[PDB]
Every structure is written in C-alpha cells, then in structure tokens.
C-alpha cells in the first residue's frame, strides 16, 4: 500500500485535488523464480549419478567451473527405433538466464533432428517443444529427455543415421 501516511500529519486544505504530488512508481510486477545455480548443482548430481536405464546423462564439462556453463548430455537409443542402441553426445551451454529461458543446446555427436542441424548440432528451440515453451521446471535432463523422445518418434526415427558415433568437430 504505497502512500505518504504513517500516523500523524500537518497542513491539509484540499483532500481531493491533486495540487502537487509525485509518488515514486515505475514497475508493477515482482520477479519470482527458483535459483539457477541450485538446479545446476542438484541436477548435476542426479545426472552424473544416473537415471532410469541411463537413457541420458547431463554431466559437467570442466570439473573446475563455478556457474557450470559448458554442460554435457549423453543419450542412448530406444529399442525398436532408428536410433535404438545408439549413444549420443551433447553439449548444453547455460549462461545468463538458463532455467528461465531456452538454453543453447547443441549435439556434439552426429545426429539428424528436424530442429537440430546436421553440421554443428545446434538444437533449434523453434522445433523443440521444451525449448519453444521453456519453463522454470525444465532442466538439462528435460532437454535431453525431450529431444531424445522425439528421436524415438516416427518423425525423427526415420531420418538416416550416420555410419558411426563420431563427433561434429575434429
């Protein structure tokens, strides 16, 4: 309740007209959200430790960082699919505003996704759902889990796979 009254006062003739008032105002919304580094640390353990059938793994690139930017995402192929029985490496960049906005994900290995290029592996957030409508509950595991989920679908599980699990860069 912004105002200019606490208890007492003095001098007051017009209690309706403006006369001369200048209250400090600008914004009209607060900023609520879960800590960024927190998700990284908590998710760092969950990813490094392991997941259901180890379908993916979101570990750290350099075990000597602070904000944990250069991430690494592993992925396994699901039986009964073009990708089935095929590992996949990834690198997720998370800097300014990560769990609050679409991260910069890029496949290191050789992968072919409708939203991910077949040269560098830059995962386009326009194609990826989790990235398009990125939320606060999303994380690296969600990114890896979601993208891989599409790979299992008929859409991505039809594209021609590479003749090896080599990376994209030398």
CSV table of C-alpha atoms in Angstrom, one decimal:
chain,number,residue,atom,x,y,z
A,1,UNK,CA,0.0,0.0,0.0
A,2,UNK,CA,2.1,2.9,-1.3
A,3,UNK,CA,1.3,6.3,0.2
A,4,UNK,CA,2.6,9.1,2.5
A,5,UNK,CA,0.8,8.5,5.8
A,6,UNK,CA,2.1,6.8,8.9
A,7,UNK,CA,0.3,8.2,11.9
A,8,UNK,CA,0.3,12.0,12.4
A,9,UNK,CA,0.5,14.9,9.9
A,10,UNK,CA,0.0,18.6,9.4
A,11,UNK,CA,-1.1,21.2,6.9
A,12,UNK,CA,-4.0,19.9,4.7
A,13,UNK,CA,-6.7,22.0,3.0
A,14,UNK,CA,-7.7,20.1,-0.2
A,15,UNK,CA,-8.2,16.4,0.4
A,16,UNK,CA,-9.4,15.7,-3.1
A,17,UNK,CA,-7.5,17.8,-5.7
A,18,UNK,CA,-4.0,16.8,-6.8
A,19,UNK,CA,-2.3,20.2,-6.2
A,20,UNK,CA,1.2,18.7,-6.3
A,21,UNK,CA,2.0,15.0,-5.8
A,22,UNK,CA,4.9,12.9,-7.2
A,23,UNK,CA,5.0,9.3,-5.9
A,24,UNK,CA,7.9,7.0,-6.9
A,25,UNK,CA,6.4,4.5,-9.3
A,26,UNK,CA,7.6,2.6,-12.4
A,27,UNK,CA,7.2,-1.2,-12.3
A,28,UNK,CA,4.1,-3.2,-11.3
A,29,UNK,CA,5.4,-6.8,-11.1
A,30,UNK,CA,7.8,-8.7,-8.9
A,31,UNK,CA,10.4,-11.3,-10.0
A,32,UNK,CA,9.7,-14.7,-8.6
A,33,UNK,CA,11.7,-17.8,-9.7
A,34,UNK,CA,13.8,-20.7,-8.4
A,35,UNK,CA,17.6,-20.2,-8.1
A,36,UNK,CA,19.6,-21.0,-11.2
A,37,UNK,CA,22.8,-22.5,-9.7
A,38,UNK,CA,20.6,-24.6,-7.4
A,39,UNK,CA,19.1,-26.5,-10.3
A,40,UNK,CA,22.5,-26.9,-11.8
A,41,UNK,CA,24.0,-28.4,-8.6
A,42,UNK,CA,21.0,-30.6,-7.7
A,43,UNK,CA,20.7,-31.6,-11.4
A,44,UNK,CA,24.4,-32.1,-11.6
A,45,UNK,CA,24.3,-34.9,-9.1
A,46,UNK,CA,21.1,-36.5,-10.5
A,47,UNK,CA,22.6,-36.5,-13.9
A,48,UNK,CA,26.1,-37.6,-13.0
A,49,UNK,CA,24.8,-40.4,-10.7
A,50,UNK,CA,22.5,-41.9,-13.3
A,51,UNK,CA,18.9,-42.2,-14.5
A,52,UNK,CA,16.3,-44.8,-15.4
A,53,UNK,CA,18.2,-47.3,-17.6
A,54,UNK,CA,20.7,-44.5,-18.2
A,55,UNK,CA,18.9,-43.1,-21.2
A,56,UNK,CA,20.8,-39.9,-20.8
A,57,UNK,CA,23.4,-38.1,-18.7
A,58,UNK,CA,23.8,-34.4,-18.1
A,59,UNK,CA,27.3,-34.1,-16.6
A,60,UNK,CA,29.7,-31.2,-16.3
A,61,UNK,CA,32.3,-30.5,-18.9
A,62,UNK,CA,35.0,-28.9,-16.8
A,63,UNK,CA,35.1,-30.2,-13.2
A,64,UNK,CA,36.5,-26.8,-12.1
A,65,UNK,CA,33.8,-24.4,-13.0
A,66,UNK,CA,31.6,-22.1,-10.9
A,67,UNK,CA,28.3,-21.3,-12.7
A,68,UNK,CA,28.5,-24.6,-14.8
A,69,UNK,CA,28.0,-23.3,-18.3
A,70,UNK,CA,29.5,-25.9,-20.7
A,71,UNK,CA,27.3,-28.9,-20.0
A,72,UNK,CA,27.5,-32.4,-21.5
A,73,UNK,CA,24.5,-34.5,-22.3
A,74,UNK,CA,24.7,-38.2,-23.1
A,75,UNK,CA,21.8,-40.2,-24.8
A,76,UNK,CA,21.0,-43.8,-25.5
A,77,UNK,CA,18.9,-45.2,-28.3
A,78,UNK,CA,15.5,-46.8,-27.5
A,79,UNK,CA,14.9,-50.3,-28.8
A,80,UNK,CA,12.6,-50.6,-31.9
A,81,UNK,CA,13.8,-47.3,-33.5
A,82,UNK,CA,16.3,-46.0,-36.0
A,83,UNK,CA,18.2,-44.5,-33.0
A,84,UNK,CA,17.8,-47.7,-30.9
A,85,UNK,CA,21.0,-49.0,-29.4
A,86,UNK,CA,22.9,-45.8,-30.4
A,87,UNK,CA,24.6,-43.5,-27.9
A,88,UNK,CA,24.7,-39.7,-28.5
A,89,UNK,CA,26.8,-37.0,-27.0
A,90,UNK,CA,25.7,-33.4,-26.4
A,91,UNK,CA,26.9,-30.1,-25.0
A,92,UNK,CA,24.5,-27.7,-23.4
A,93,UNK,CA,25.5,-24.0,-22.8
A,94,UNK,CA,23.8,-22.3,-19.9
A,95,UNK,CA,24.9,-18.8,-19.0
A,96,UNK,CA,22.6,-15.7,-18.4
A,97,UNK,CA,19.1,-16.8,-17.6
A,98,UNK,CA,19.0,-20.6,-18.1
A,99,UNK,CA,16.1,-22.3,-16.2
A,100,UNK,CA,14.0,-19.2,-17.0
A,101,UNK,CA,14.6,-19.3,-20.8
A,102,UNK,CA,15.5,-21.6,-23.7
A,103,UNK,CA,19.2,-22.8,-23.3
A,104,UNK,CA,21.7,-23.1,-26.1
A,105,UNK,CA,21.8,-26.8,-26.7
A,106,UNK,CA,24.0,-28.4,-29.4
A,107,UNK,CA,24.6,-32.0,-30.4
A,108,UNK,CA,28.3,-33.0,-30.4
A,109,UNK,CA,27.8,-36.4,-32.0
A,110,UNK,CA,26.4,-37.0,-35.5
A,111,UNK,CA,22.6,-36.6,-35.2
A,112,UNK,CA,19.7,-35.7,-37.5
A,113,UNK,CA,16.8,-33.9,-35.9
A,114,UNK,CA,14.1,-31.8,-37.5
A,115,UNK,CA,15.0,-29.0,-35.1
A,116,UNK,CA,18.7,-29.8,-34.9
A,117,UNK,CA,21.1,-29.1,-37.8
A,118,UNK,CA,23.3,-31.8,-39.3
A,119,UNK,CA,26.5,-29.8,-39.3
A,120,UNK,CA,27.2,-28.4,-35.8
A,121,UNK,CA,24.3,-29.8,-34.0
A,122,UNK,CA,22.7,-26.6,-32.9
A,123,UNK,CA,19.3,-27.6,-31.5
A,124,UNK,CA,16.8,-25.0,-32.8
A,125,UNK,CA,14.4,-24.0,-30.0
A,126,UNK,CA,11.7,-23.3,-32.6
A,127,UNK,CA,11.4,-27.1,-33.4
A,128,UNK,CA,12.0,-28.4,-29.9
A,129,UNK,CA,8.9,-28.2,-27.7
A,130,UNK,CA,10.6,-28.0,-24.3
A,131,UNK,CA,12.7,-25.2,-25.7
A,132,UNK,CA,9.9,-23.4,-27.5
A,133,UNK,CA,7.7,-23.1,-24.4
A,134,UNK,CA,10.6,-23.3,-22.0
A,135,UNK,CA,9.5,-23.1,-18.3
A,136,UNK,CA,11.0,-23.0,-14.8
A,137,UNK,CA,10.5,-26.7,-14.1
A,138,UNK,CA,12.6,-27.5,-17.2
A,139,UNK,CA,16.3,-28.6,-16.9
A,140,UNK,CA,19.1,-30.3,-18.8
A,141,UNK,CA,17.6,-33.7,-18.2
A,142,UNK,CA,14.3,-32.4,-19.6
A,143,UNK,CA,16.2,-31.1,-22.6
A,144,UNK,CA,18.0,-34.4,-23.2
A,145,UNK,CA,14.9,-36.5,-22.3
A,146,UNK,CA,12.7,-34.4,-24.6
A,147,UNK,CA,14.9,-34.2,-27.7
A,148,UNK,CA,15.7,-37.9,-27.4
A,149,UNK,CA,11.9,-38.6,-27.0
A,150,UNK,CA,11.4,-37.0,-30.4
A,151,UNK,CA,14.2,-39.2,-31.8
A,152,UNK,CA,12.1,-42.2,-30.8
A,153,UNK,CA,9.1,-40.8,-32.6
A,154,UNK,CA,8.4,-41.8,-36.3
A,155,UNK,CA,9.3,-38.2,-37.3
A,156,UNK,CA,13.0,-38.4,-36.2
A,157,UNK,CA,13.2,-42.2,-36.1
A,158,UNK,CA,13.0,-42.3,-39.9
A,159,UNK,CA,15.9,-39.9,-40.9
A,160,UNK,CA,19.1,-41.7,-42.0
A,161,UNK,CA,21.5,-42.2,-39.1
A,162,UNK,CA,25.3,-41.8,-39.5
A,163,UNK,CA,27.8,-44.7,-40.0
A,164,UNK,CA,29.5,-44.0,-36.6
A,165,UNK,CA,29.2,-42.2,-33.3
A,166,UNK,CA,31.8,-39.6,-34.3
A,167,UNK,CA,31.5,-36.0,-33.1
A,168,UNK,CA,30.9,-33.0,-35.3
A,169,UNK,CA,34.2,-31.2,-34.9
A,170,UNK,CA,37.8,-32.5,-35.0
